[PDB]
């Protein structure tokens, strides 16, 4: 997972090269931190909103 300076989370694989899925809302401003939970199912997003 990567959190962008603009309004997007990028879901990648280890061996992908291009983004498996992308995440955005209108209410999420600038994602500064993005980390997993400790089962690998959910992803957790701290933004500038």
């Amino acid at each position: 997972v990567s959190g962008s300076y603009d309004r997007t989370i990028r879901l990648w694989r280890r061996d992908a090269g291009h983004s498996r899925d992308v995440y955005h809302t209108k209410r999420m401003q600038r994602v500064f931190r993005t980390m997993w939970t400790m089962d690998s199912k959910y992803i957790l997003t701290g933004s500038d909103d």
């Binding site: 209108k26 209410r27 401003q29």
Partner: protein, 49 residues
């Protein structure tokens, strides 16, 4: 005591970072966050309901 529904903070957050001052004054932690549960996030019908 002023109460601010999550429809209202939802609409202020949907309005872009032009209004980041109005959001940062709207999330005053003094105030009663009145959590609503209905699908719309439409403030005028939440308030009249």
């Amino acid at each position: 005591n002023i109460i601010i529904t999550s429809c209202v903070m939802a609409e202020l957050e949907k309005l872009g970072p032009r209004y980041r001052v109005a959001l940062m004054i709207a999330r005053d932690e003094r105030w009663q966050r009145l959590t609503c549960d209905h699908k719309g996030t439409y403030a005028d019908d939440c308030i009249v309901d």
